[PDB]
From a paper:
The protein, termed Pa Dps, adopts the Dps subunit fold and oligomerizes into a nearly spherical 12-mer quaternary structure at pH 6.0 or in the presence of divalent cations at neutral pH and above. The 12-Mer Pa Dps contains two di-iron centers at the interface of each subunit dimer, coordinated by conserved His, Glu, and Asp residues. In vitro, the di-iron centers catalyze the oxidation of Fe2+ utilizing H2O2 (not O2) as an oxidant, suggesting Pa Dps functions to aid P. aeruginosa to survive H2O2-mediated oxidative stress. The Pa Dps structure harbors a novel network of Tyr residues at the interface of each subunit dimer between the two di-iron centers, which captures radicals generated during Fe2+ oxidation at the ferroxidase centers and forms di-tyrosine linkages, thus effectively trapping the radicals within the Dps shell.
Structure solution and refinement resulted in a Dps-o model containing 12 subunits in the asymmetric unit. The Cl− associated with each subunit is surrounded by residues in the long loop and residues in α5. The Na+ is located at inter-subunit sites coordinated by H37 from one subunit and D64 and E68 from the second subunit; only five of the twelve D64 residues coordinate a sodium ion in the structure, and these may be interchangeable with water molecules. The Dps-o structure revealed the presence of a Na+ coordinated by ferroxidase center ligands H37, D64, and E68.
Residue numbers in the entry:
A (entry chain A), F (entry chain G), I (entry chain J), K (entry chain E), L (entry chain D): 1 to 155
B (entry chain K), C (entry chain H), D (entry chain B), E (entry chain I), H (entry chain C), J (entry chain F): 1 to 156
G (entry chain L): 2 to 156
The structure:
Amino acid sequence: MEINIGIGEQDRAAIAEGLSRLLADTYTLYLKTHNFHWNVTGPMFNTLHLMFEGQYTELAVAVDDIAERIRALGFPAPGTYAAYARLSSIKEEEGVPEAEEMIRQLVQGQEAVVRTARSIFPLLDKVSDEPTADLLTQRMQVHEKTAWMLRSLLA
Amino acid sequence: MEINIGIGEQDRAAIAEGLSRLLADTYTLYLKTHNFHWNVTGPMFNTLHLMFEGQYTELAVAVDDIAERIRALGFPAPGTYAAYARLSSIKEEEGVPEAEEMIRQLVQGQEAVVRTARSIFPLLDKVSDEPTADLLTQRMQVHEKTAWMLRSLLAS
Amino acid sequence: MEINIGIGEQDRAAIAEGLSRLLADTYTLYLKTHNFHWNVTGPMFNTLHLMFEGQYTELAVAVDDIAERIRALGFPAPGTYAAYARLSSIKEEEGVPEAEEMIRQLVQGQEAVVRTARSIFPLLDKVSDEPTADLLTQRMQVHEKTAWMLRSLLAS
Amino acid sequence: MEINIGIGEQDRAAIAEGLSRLLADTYTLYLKTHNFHWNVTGPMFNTLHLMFEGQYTELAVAVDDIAERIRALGFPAPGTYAAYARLSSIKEEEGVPEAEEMIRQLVQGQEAVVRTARSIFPLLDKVSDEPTADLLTQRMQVHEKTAWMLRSLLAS
Amino acid sequence: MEINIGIGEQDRAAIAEGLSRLLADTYTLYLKTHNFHWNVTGPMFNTLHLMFEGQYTELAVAVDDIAERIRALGFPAPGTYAAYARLSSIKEEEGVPEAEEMIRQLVQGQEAVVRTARSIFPLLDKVSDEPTADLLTQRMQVHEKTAWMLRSLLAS
Amino acid sequence: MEINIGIGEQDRAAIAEGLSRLLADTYTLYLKTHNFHWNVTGPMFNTLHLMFEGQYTELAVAVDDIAERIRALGFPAPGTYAAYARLSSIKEEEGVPEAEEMIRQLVQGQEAVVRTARSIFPLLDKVSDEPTADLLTQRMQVHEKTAWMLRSLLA
Amino acid sequence: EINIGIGEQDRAAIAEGLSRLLADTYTLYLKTHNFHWNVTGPMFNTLHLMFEGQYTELAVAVDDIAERIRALGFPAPGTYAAYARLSSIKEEEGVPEAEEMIRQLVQGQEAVVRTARSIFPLLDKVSDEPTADLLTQRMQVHEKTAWMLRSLLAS
Amino acid sequence: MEINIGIGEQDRAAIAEGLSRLLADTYTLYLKTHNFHWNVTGPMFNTLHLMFEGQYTELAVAVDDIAERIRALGFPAPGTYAAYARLSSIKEEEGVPEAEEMIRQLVQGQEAVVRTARSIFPLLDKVSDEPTADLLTQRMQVHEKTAWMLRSLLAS
Amino acid sequence: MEINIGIGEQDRAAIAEGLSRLLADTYTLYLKTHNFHWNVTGPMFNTLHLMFEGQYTELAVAVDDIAERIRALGFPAPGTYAAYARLSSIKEEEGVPEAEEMIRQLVQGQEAVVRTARSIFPLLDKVSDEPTADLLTQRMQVHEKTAWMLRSLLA
Amino acid sequence: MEINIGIGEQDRAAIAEGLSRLLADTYTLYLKTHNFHWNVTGPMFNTLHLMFEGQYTELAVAVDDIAERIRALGFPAPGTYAAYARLSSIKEEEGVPEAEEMIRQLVQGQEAVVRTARSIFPLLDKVSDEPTADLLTQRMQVHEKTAWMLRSLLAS
Amino acid sequence: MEINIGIGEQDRAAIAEGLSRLLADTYTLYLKTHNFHWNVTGPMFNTLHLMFEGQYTELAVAVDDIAERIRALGFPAPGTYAAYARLSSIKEEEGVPEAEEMIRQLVQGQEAVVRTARSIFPLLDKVSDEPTADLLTQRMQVHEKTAWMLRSLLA
Amino acid sequence: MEINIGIGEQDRAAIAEGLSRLLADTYTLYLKTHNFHWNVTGPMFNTLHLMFEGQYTELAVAVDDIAERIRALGFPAPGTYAAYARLSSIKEEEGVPEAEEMIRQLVQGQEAVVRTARSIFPLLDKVSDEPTADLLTQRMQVHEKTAWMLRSLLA
Ligand SMILES: [Cl-]
Ligand SMILES: [Cl-]
Ligand SMILES: [Cl-]
Ligand SMILES: [Cl-]
Ligand SMILES: [Cl-]
Ligand SMILES: [Cl-]
Ligand SMILES: [Cl-]
Ligand SMILES: [Cl-]
Ligand SMILES: [Cl-]
Ligand SMILES: [Cl-]
Ligand SMILES: [Cl-]
Ligand SMILES: [Cl-]
Ligand SMILES: [Cl-]
Ligand SMILES: [Cl-]
Ligand SMILES: [Cl-]
Ligand SMILES: [Cl-]
Ligand SMILES: [Cl-]
Ligand SMILES: [Cl-]
Ligand SMILES: [Cl-]
Ligand SMILES: [Cl-]
Ligand SMILES: [Cl-]
Ligand SMILES: [Cl-]
Ligand SMILES: [Cl-]
Ligand SMILES: [Cl-]
Ligand code: NA
Ligand code: NA
Ligand code: NA
Ligand code: NA
Ligand code: NA
Ligand code: NA
Ligand code: NA
Ligand code: NA
Ligand code: NA
Ligand code: NA
Ligand code: NA
Ligand code: NA
């Protein structure tokens, strides 16, 4: 069936490509947060183990919300290691950092997702895509709140 | 008491007029979806009976949310067959279509509500009615998601 | 597939027609109650907004129970503005009455549905349809209880 | 202690005999539905696995309700394979039919329980056993609704 | 506001008189059960303290259902010691019986409520009061089930 | 088995007699509140129907708490119309008052239960029965709160 | 095709064993349900409740066993004729005294355990850890239930 | 650690200052509503005690949402009587007004918070802070809805 | 309608004045705890954010309980910034202390409320106001428990 | 930090010593009740297994409440077999008594805890420790209720 | 601190290596299942969208359970695209297959995880690591149940 | 009534003896963990007060499960201070250690329970007691996970 939602196909394609980067960054942050949840040690173990659990649980919902918007626009949602590695701007961490460096990297990760979200708003400038704008806004809100909670631990 | 929310009376009346159309389209889609929930048959009965139930349950809440926004603007919320027949832009189905045609009509219905919402946005941008703009945005999100799920069923 | 539930097709058709009137009245009362929920004002706002919400929430379940009995008898459940306007005996209200008149109209609405339910029992005279009789009975119970609560508000 | 509930002992015995047949048929349909839940295959697996689960869960409660009514009347509730094989009127399926034949058999099973309940009503009318009549009415309501949902799957 | 539910005033008064007897019986059995819950002793303490709690909790709801039906018919619901002592057919117990005698009295109490309910049906048939008949039927179901559970405790 | 809880039998009997009056008053107020819940009419119907429901639901628990304290002291809990009518100081209402008179009577009923509870403390002053004193105090707290809510409606 | 490391002949033999376990469990389920309805005497309330807990558990157990048969690629039996043929539970067509009901339910638990024990040799030279775990869980439940039941028969 | 969220420090500080105003107005409305909840009397006591409770419960959560956005921007959230008395535009009520005047003051309070929120959008437009704009919009929605419910109570 | 709860009007006014001070101290501590919840930083952020949330949630219930007792006694409950600043003995904190100083101040706050509660018991000496005494006792219990939890962090 | 709760250190130490005896008695009764829950047999198994579970579940909460009051007073809470064996006045039971003797011992245990609690009030007379007095009162209330339920099982 | 759980360090390292492969396969199947959930179309959309959601939700918990057993053994849990792509034996799908091919690939994926689990059991039997053996048993149970449900759709 | 669950009386007695040691160790760890929950202080108070609460709550359930398995085998479950002191291999702490020493003792306590469990498997293999072996395996899983979380705090 045709897709008749007030956005041309070329614009929908461009928006889906932007949201694909957002999905890749969100998913990459999801796994890094999960990773640090398992692997953190030291006197902050209990508090960070729990904090990182709350974060990755939220990000698992977020990846669905972003993927579903891509589908609503009429495009497949990427979902493989190869696709996400190509699309993601998150810095990979292959070892086990000290707890304070884990915190720092997760702050940087929140800010990287915000930066990707901000990069999509220009694609919406000439277009009427209020739902996508709202999704970007909700993601920025969560990541900016999470950045505050994380960087507070480093004070 | 006067209404002092940063939107003048003429503009609030115009927003209420638009939301009355959105309310009527949402209600018409609600009743059509409820109808199809009762009346669908064929091998997809269990999946569509359930899917249409989720949809009309969500739409019943949306009807309340739209009507309450009209009230917050200072105007009566329409709520009769006669009013909704005039205000709506969705054709009702008077018979019992095959399941695939029911699906197609509900795709078109989602898009008709999005189209009505789209007709109201320029007014909201002009007068800066941020809460109504957010309401319309949420409706567009829901309807565009539901259109994806429905049309997916028609793919080969 | 054949329907073999101890009621012949001609009787099932007649009972389904009667229940179609009950469905239309119940749905029309549902929307009127929803309408008054949004639109009531005055010192009784909070209590009537809440009371009417309880009522239309219940009526939304009731319309399913009625429509599903029609389907069990082997007939399509009506569900459009045109079909309900034709079948309904509820008096339409296109304006915004005072709170006390909203209450009076909803009492009349309860009693109108009861009258419609009572009108169906003769169709069951010569047939064995205990489930339909029970459905009518349950609706009469709910509407008679609601009528007491509503009219109590109009006493001194 | 004496049982003084307005029905004499011989009539209570007769009602308990009838309910024993209804219990056996309900239990036979319960086990058949549970069987088909485990064993159904094909593209309708997910939806029929779930649909049949809802049905056998409901029937498990019904068997308790029927057995407890026999106890209230002063008689033991039958509860063995031998008793249910004798008292039932539903043929069990010993193999694994295709999904559409499973559905067809469950339609016929609902109608079989209705037919057994129908066989008991003249006695209940004669001795005015209101609680048992209401129990049979609820069972007919459930089975007739379930028959609609099942046979709908066999339509085009 | 008038009551127009298909039953004339003198007939509604007659139904309310019957239900006032049923309410008084039910409330008196409620307090007796509550009393025995507090006061039972012996090796059956835990089981009877719990069983009686379940019963009086249910009866507290039932007294509401009965009182509300009286109100729906247009009459005040009795609710004093003097009114219930006058209307009730339950035997008063001013002491603390042995556990087995408490059980026996509670069996008789269930049957007293059933007997009152059974006396009301002919009037309901005459004037076609279907909701009240269903109320009576549901109470008979609960009380006849409870009588079975209670008297079972007295067997060998 | 003997009762050895630090209170002699004659004192326990006297305390149980006082609590029997409290139980009778509480139960009589319970039924009056239930009665007015069914029978109230007028423009306050919805609010008073609900308010009175909350009150009699609470009173149903209270009668259990009082009866169980009587049992813990080693005495039977009264539980019949004749016993409560004999013991109760609540004024009986055989008709259907107007809503404002229902409210007034329920205020008086709360205050009557408080008066009965207060009448028991002198007995405890001699004996040291801390759990009974606490029960009386809880009942006074509830009834004094409820009296405020009720009389506010009449302001 | 089914490639879970077992091979169809062993899957068939294990499924036959689990078919006996299913029949015994289902037959005990119905017998427990029967005794729940039909028990009388001073133990009525406690046995009515105890037997309800047991048959509620067994209703879940029959699903767990049937699903394992399906995972092994065989149909789950489910008729009176099939269960009469497969089951080793002693049938009871009357209404025993409460103490004899308890005794028969003890014997029923032990019969299910005996059937479960008979299946473990079918898992020699097979890698079927999930079936072994299922048998183990059923033995745990029935051995616990047997203790609770036989405790009622002690002096 | 640096804050790199696409908004420079000077603009974050200015937005946080605006949100500090909103927090103070929300908290002052919270305390006023809580106060009126305790102190309201008259025949509307039950309805207003409950309505004001729902409002202050909601506002207790709202102050968290606003305070947390201030923290996300990198600034401390004000939280003392001195700070809120200074920052707020809402005149507190030091006495116990009649119920109608409590309602009127709470309507005015909703509109004062809305006015404060509307005062912040100009800053956000120039700098692009979408999350803060969404927070403002959500608060405006709640307060405009609440203003409708409150002022409805004052109608004739 | 008159208030007849066994306490004369002059005594009720005196008790209500005492409770007004308790309300003001409890509310001031409520807002200080809420403040520190938002504003705390450092490695204890997660645990103190949560701990302070539990505390202010409890104090919000407590201010209702205290205010409602004032209303039950027949007097208006105070509820403005000016009324509470006038009545409160809590030391105000206009800045953002280090986490350890936040903890110390919250210990002091618990002890200040206890002090205010203790100051009211003499009024209840000549007068029998058992519900108010119980309310004071419950507040002291809660605040003394909270003080232990807080000061343990500084050990 | 200093402890400034209006009780001097020497008095807090004496109160903590009394509460340590209460904690030891409560914990010893907790384990004895848990023991009897596992080990009871006979026709009362189901009712006593359950009753003792309710009791030990409550006692597990109480040991926390008592221990936390010791900590609030500024002293360590004892928590070892040696510490409790030294402090406890409960009679130890190393075997498996008959069910009636288990009940009797648990009655004696409730009364022993009450005796210990009562022994502490003299300390609180000279001092002002209202929270500790309330804790003692709540424990006495629970143990006196439980003693009634237990000894009722031993009545004729 | 020493790890003294009855398994020597070299053996724990070898078990962790095997569990790292199992984690990688489970995570790859998790993402593939999540992918197919978003991207499936055709008349089976509703049923497969829901079924695949149930599966990936379960796998998300399983990933946690496997990773935390690795931690309990004293080794870091791998958690990056590069690590999983190196360790995983699952075939990734970079396109959008038809619904029946998605089902077939998910059947293969269940059987692939079972193969990996089966390859680890000999080490666990040699070492007597009973908790890890139970974990692998539960994974085999779930994947074998899931394989039945999936392949039933293709009959 | 006889016990016929496929294990002879002397072998059941031997299993019950092993489980009696396991029960005693689990109960001793339960009380030590409960003690440390009450008594821990210092900057880790919030995280350890909570962590130790979760642990003792879980252990309270574990003692029931172990005790009930002894009963299912036909033997009394030990349940006194004297029995547990005799049977237990955990040394109790009579004082109030620093938080880090509390953590270390609780790690050693987890490993002590595991050590007792491991000693019992040869008997269970010999007589084929599968339910007891699963119980031991579940306890080892919990204790090995808990040891990891505890010792991580010391890194
Ligand atoms: Cl995101
Ligand atoms: Cl990054
Ligand atoms: Cl919409
Ligand atoms: Cl359309
Ligand atoms: Cl009408
Ligand atoms: Cl209706
Ligand atoms: Cl049936
Ligand atoms: Cl059939
Ligand atoms: Cl009744
Ligand atoms: Cl009687
Ligand atoms: Cl009271
Ligand atoms: Cl009075
Ligand atoms: Cl089994
Ligand atoms: Cl057997
Ligand atoms: Cl204002
Ligand atoms: Cl706000
Ligand atoms: Cl306080
Ligand atoms: Cl301070
Ligand atoms: Cl205690
Ligand atoms: Cl003792
Ligand atoms: Cl896995
Ligand atoms: Cl694969
Ligand atoms: Cl353990
Ligand atoms: Cl150790
Ligand atoms: Na999804
Ligand atoms: Na609404
Ligand atoms: Na429906
Ligand atoms: Na039952
Ligand atoms: Na009621
Ligand atoms: Na009770
Ligand atoms: Na199943
Ligand atoms: Na917060
Ligand atoms: Na309040
Ligand atoms: Na604790
Ligand atoms: Na985890
Ligand atoms: Na237990």
